[PDB]
Subunit: 242 residues, 4 copies
């Protein structure tokens, strides 16, 4: 039994195997770039379509193998779960009146992140910030929800494209947060009917802007506070212990 | 006497009471989201209106109770003052030719910030920066006031929508500070009549931008200077005292 | 002789004198805000005009006095030089076919910065950064000059409003640096004639953006490097000297 | 032999030589600014054209000399390589149906950066950050490539100006990253046909924005972590060694 199992485990945990997979990702990447062109597709079109159907069958083996080799531990791995879903997507057939999935196929190129350790590290690094930010995101989202409800009620009847709905207002308030056209595009028009509308949007811009800056400052200053704690230990320990 | 008073104080300072209040906030939140839809309002409309009239009577008890339990100390509490005003708003009746207040009702969902300690902390944290910034805000506001007066006098007669008034110019100068359409929307048009107008707006953009960046840098560098002072004490004390 | 001189020096260096001056600044401030309105000017117009002619004569005494009291040292003072020029401006009479100066009158409200120590400190603080930035500004300005010359030569004949002139191109390149309408407003139009124009503007946006961010980072990291040097001294001196 | 070689090496490594070169750069700079004007070119036009043909012959000597003096070491020098190419450009004759190069002539003013040590230092300083950023740029570029392919496939048939091509989509996605017109100009139009398009662009804006901020924070916090390591050594060494 454990004779057969290790036969595959030595294959899977192989460096070659990894490298081979990575080789395909890059190739199926270059492939999917060229499929973008209907010129290319009119000549070398069909070659590409089978290469796609190959790579995807190969990748399905890969995952089955990875699962057999890792069993439970695989579904406990964020990176493997990703690889499952991003290949699973590529399995569900175009046929069934949902041409959208034919467009998501290309998420399988994210496997290159999943398969290359220095990419993995970066992603892990970026993500590591988020869980501290969760409450602040929640507060900001509540803030949006309140203001979105208020604007729907104040401006939605005269300005329904922008505020007719909680979603329209959620969308407009995000545009205002990015400051895209907020004045020329949105508020200057609102004021033609609601002259005091600036009393809603300037303070919204102040709060939302102030928060994002403070978040950044908090992150930097709080992180530098830890590095200073860590110094105190090692500087004070070599003063005490010596 | 102090028999009856403590009967309520044990209720109010109850965890259950807090949790119950919080439960309503979330529900009256979800409620006010659905009121946004006239579809929903045409079916389940009236259920919602009474739930609103209940929650608001309940919340008025809550505050009366909170006041009896806390007396003076309550009106010395920013968080309670908020809760008073944000519920008071919700009391003043729609009737009296001011439909605006019907739209402010929803500020009562900010109680969720007021009622949940980790939200409270964040808000306290964000606000803690402001009092150091006060003079700089004052300087910036003076700067706006001077430039707003100057632009009203230079451009207001040909460009009254944007500069006819001190307020129009205050509003335009804030749009320029955010850089929304400043060139295409405002300055490029001004130059068609006042070719040297760029001499007003580029330097305004330099000053205002430079200041906001410097403020951020000052905050970070000045905060890291304190954390280094605090280290000196503990590092130097364990060198001296030992 | 030095009997008479000190008679005035005790007046000038008076706290009252300072406070009186500051009192006028605020009042002549509020005044110049109300002059903004032709409604107000049609009623209380003339009161205002004489108050202006008073304040300005008073301020001219002030400066003469300040000069007599300080002699050479006055013209060596940036803050006094400012006060000289910002009041001098207000002296040159509207008459002489230059209505622009009537609009600069209001720069005299900057005296409030000049006259209030906590404002003075802020301004001094903001300015303290600039001299380190001088070379980098020079580099950036050279960069603009080169790119402005290149764009005038590439795009100015088809796009003269935006690039016909070194100044037009200098102005457009600053708009691109702020990212105002850079694509929709400028580059997307250029591409209709010069399809590879993106090869000029994306890299311009990368360089200019990268530099401004790096400048900020350099300032923060370099400033935190000094505060760490200063610690080393005091931490190492109390280790050696004790 | 080494008699003749040193005759030139003393010339080239001369301070005067450097200063002379720098003098021309500034002059040929001022020159190329004035060539921008067809007024000036109609009067003093030809003077300028020969001055240009002189400066460029002189600069070609300079480089030949620099090469003879430095041999191999020259082509190992980024700054000299630059000087070679930026002067080489200026050699290839306008004639050959490529009027574009007549516009690149002016890159030779970048020699002033190359020739002035404090400029050199800045450029070296800015560049010093990039190699750490390489992987993150690669990740971001992969991200753009995936999203550009997806948008070409989702929106390119109805919105070909913006998404018809991988390049059009690459270009649009960069405009969205800068947030120029992203909503009013791009997404609001897309939604008229593809109402859920916001599900593509908001998350694209979140990822891309989050990353750029994190990069800046990482740089600052990671750099301050090194300066704290360096302190530990010198603070702990003067505790141990003394
Ligand atoms: C998201 O799920 C949360 C996880 C957190 O797991 P994490 O603890 O980061 O990973 C395991 C431990 N580590 C970092 C040392 C390898 O996140 C991860 O670390 C796993 C990431 C899962 C998604 C795969 C990434 C898709 C590519 C998207 C990158 C585009 C950004 C430009
Ligand atoms: C410090 C960190 C800063 C981040 C804090 C900001 C939080 C707010 C996020 C704003 C993004 C919302 C975008 C948005 O409004 O999308 C629309 C959706 C769906 O409603 P709706 O728009 O009617 O559906 C599509 C129809 N159309 C054409 C009118 C748009 O609108 C909705 O109804 C729901 C929106 C999603 C919920 C928000 C959760 C985001 C967590 C991140
Ligand atoms: C800290 C947590 C904060 C979380 C906040 C995130 C919530 C985001 C919800 C986004 C709303 C999604 C729906 C949307 O945008 O569309 C508006 C709809 C449509 O109105 P309706 O007129 O029904 O349109 C249907 C089409 N018709 C008329 C032709 C049949 O109108 C509606 O159906 C309104 C939907 C309201 C549902 C509210 C759910 C969120 C509960 C969060 C509670 C916060 C606690 C205080
Ligand atoms: C480092 C921190 C950065 C912050 C410093 C920036 C300070 C300047 C704040 C700019 C915001 C002003 C917004 C603004 O101008 O609003 C208009 C008001 C009212 O005048 P007005 O606009 O005529 O009334 C409405 C009529 N309409 C349609 C023509 C707008 O304009 C006014 O007349 C008064 C404006 C309020 C006073 C400013 C106090 C803000 C403190 C924060
Ligand atoms: C460090 C502190 C700095 C603080 C600065 C903040 C001041 C912000 C004031 C905002 C101005 C609010 C009024 C506004 O924007 O509207 C412009 C008005 C209206 O002109 P008007 O033609 O009267 O319009 C009335 C309508 N009508 C003609 C049909 C009867 O025209 C006016 O009435 C002008 C109002 C001028 C009042 C000035 C009050 C601020 C005093 C601050 C003193 C600073 C010390 C140097
Ligand atoms: C500009 O000229 C350079 C000077 C540098 O002199 P500085 O060494 O800063 O002043 C003397 C010493 N201090 C700081 C301890 C008082 O800069 C100054 O310190 C003097 C400032 C002269 C101009 C007066 C300020 C006008 C108000 C502009 C503020 C608007 C920004 C929002
Ligand atoms: C890290 C720090 C970032 C700062 C670095 C950026 C340096 C570049 C500054 C850009 C600002 C230039 C603004 C600009 O171009 O203004 C126009 C002037 C005058 O030429 P011109 O525009 O023909 O005169 C007015 C006619 N009109 C309607 C076509 C504009 O254009 C000119 O001809 C000369 C422009 C002034 C020289 C630049 C010195 C600025 C030092 C700060
Ligand atoms: C590190 C230092 C960098 C400093 C760079 C800052 C220089 C900024 C200069 C701004 C240019 C100001 C003039 C401007 O923008 O207008 C363009 C003019 C007008 O052309 P034109 O056709 O003569 O128009 C006159 C009107 N007309 C035809 C009806 C008689 O066309 C011209 O006259 C062009 C003016 C060129 C003068 C150049 C002066 C700057 C020398 C900096 C040297 C850098 C060293 C490499
Ligand atoms: C944290 C750091 C942030 C930086 C990360 C961002 C990376 C993405 C860079 C985006 C810039 C791309 C600009 C772009 O799309 O230019 C167009 C080219 C050429 O295709 P195409 O546009 O068809 O050729 C010109 C035709 N026209 C009029 C439709 C534009 O588009 C292409 O086909 C190729 C684009 C160049 C490859 C990207 C490599 C950039 C490395 C930096
Ligand atoms: C971490 C590394 C990431 C690096 C990503 C950077 C790649 C950027 C490539 C930019 C694409 C340049 C071409 C472009 O934008 O134009 C689109 C073309 C033109 O379509 P087409 O219809 O042939 O137009 C020709 C004109 N016609 C029809 C009249 C004869 O359509 C095409 O030809 C599409 C070109 C696809 C080539 C893909 C090359 C990049 C391979 C990167 C592999 C990533 C590994 C996962
Ligand atoms: C302070 C703000 C939120 C406001 C708040 O809650 N203020 C009350 C205290 C929150 C939001 C994101 C949080 C950081 C990130 O998680 C990254 C990192 C993780 C470590 O684990 C601890 C250090 C650090 C720097 C975190 C510190 C702090 O937690 C931050 C700045
Ligand atoms: C320096 C600038 C204003 C310019 C100025 O006044 N410069 C003259 C000195 C002001 C504006 C906001 C101020 C900070 C915040 O308050 C937060 C925090 C509170 C602590 O209590 C002390 C530390 C810290 C970091 C403050 C330091 C400093 O005070 C700041 C940066
Ligand atoms: C590093 C960059 C320019 C690039 C460069 O020149 N890099 C070669 C080294 C320049 C531009 C502005 C300069 C700062 C400001 O002056 C403020 C302050 C003044 C003190 O006096 C010394 C510290 C500090 C933080 C300065 C450090 C450094 O000088 C900076 C960051
Ligand atoms: C952390 C991020 C990338 C994300 C990542 O890879 N996270 C896994 C660990 C990368 C991108 C750019 C990198 C910096 C620059 O190079 C400048 C400088 C060079 C020194 O040599 C080492 C210090 C420093 C501050 C570098 C630290 C770190 O390397 C950075 C922040």
């Amino acid at each position: 039994g454990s004779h057969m199992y290790l036969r595959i485990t030595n294959i899977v945990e192989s460096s070659f195997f990894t490298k081979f997979i990575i080789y395909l990702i890059v190739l199926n990447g270059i492939t999917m770039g060229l499929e973008t062109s209907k010129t290319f597709m009119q000549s070398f079109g069909v070659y590409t379509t089978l290469f796609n159907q190959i790579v995807i069958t190969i990748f399905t083996i890969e995952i089955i193998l990875r699962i057999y080799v890792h069993r439970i531990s695989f579904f406990k791995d964020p990176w493997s779960l990703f690889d499952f879903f991003v290949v699973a997507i590529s399995l569900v057939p175009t046929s069934s009146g949902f041409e959208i999935l034919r467009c998501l196929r290309v998420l399988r190129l994210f496997r290159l992140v999943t398969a290359v350790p220095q990419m993995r590290k970066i992603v892990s690094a970026l993500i590591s910030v988020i869980p501290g930010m969760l409450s602040v995101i929640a507060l900001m989202t509540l803030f949006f929800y309140i203001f979105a409800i208020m604007a729907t009620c104040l401006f939605g009847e005269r300005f329904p494209e922008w505020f007719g709905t909680l979603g329209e207002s959620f969308y407009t308030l995000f545009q205002v947060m990015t400051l895209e056209s907020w004045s020329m595009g949105i508020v200057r028009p609102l004021m033609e009917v609601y002259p005091y509308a600036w009393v809603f949007f300037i303070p919204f811009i102040f709060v939302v802007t102030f928060v994002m800056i403070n978040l950044v400052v908090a992150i930097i200053v709080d992180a530098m506070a830890i590095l200073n704690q860590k110094e105190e230990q090692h500087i004070i320990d070599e003063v005490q212990s010596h």
